[PDB]
Design a protein around this ligand. Structure first.
Ligand SMILES: CCCC#C/C=C/CCCCCCCCCO
Ligand SMILES: [Mg+2]
Ligand SMILES: [Mg+2]
Length: 141
């Protein structure tokens, strides 16, 4: 659901700053990860793809070939409150987008294209949060 997705996003995004230098991602491109979900934020930069790899690797969410690791992704999603309701659909959506961009060999560029596809499909399928819902989770700390 969009609510589970807010919890996932709020945790995943904590690794943004530690990943920023290696990925070449300027604060001008994305200052806080929560803004990935703004209707207004265009998911396009190669460097955002690189950052996504960095952040994913922190939790083993990529396989050997820099595609999602389905079982690690399932376990991660299920580590959040009510995660079981989102896990199946989220892995199926990401994997469907990966297949559409399988001819992109550049890992950073492929990952940002897949990220943009996933964002559009999460909206169509009703699992895309609003930035406010993501903030609400960050603001409980
Ligand atoms: C394999 C991606 C890890 C993840 C995740 C999701 C976190 C919440 C929103 C970010 C979406 C990233 C999609 C990247 C898929 C690239 O193969
Ligand atoms: Mg710019
Ligand atoms: Mg490769």
């Amino acid at each position: 659901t969009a609510e589970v997705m807010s919890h996932v996003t709020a945790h995943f995004g904590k690794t943004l700053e530690e990943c920023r230098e290696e990925s070449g991602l300027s604060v001008d491109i994305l200052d806080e990860f929560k803004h990935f979900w703004s209707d207004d934020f265009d998911v396009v930069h190669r460097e955002l793809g690189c950052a996504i790899i960095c952040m994913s690797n922190k939790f083993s969410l990529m396989d050997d070939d820099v595609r999602m690791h389905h079982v690690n992704m399932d376990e991660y999603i299920k580590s959040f409150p009510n995660g079981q309701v989102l896990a199946e659909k989220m892995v199926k959506l990401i994997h469907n987008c990966e297949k559409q961009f399988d001819t992109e060999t550049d890992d950073c560029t492929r990952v940002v294209k897949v990220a943009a596809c996933f964002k559009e499909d999460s909206r169509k399928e009703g699992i895309a949060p609003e930035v406010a819902m993501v903030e609400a989770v960050i603001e409980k700390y």
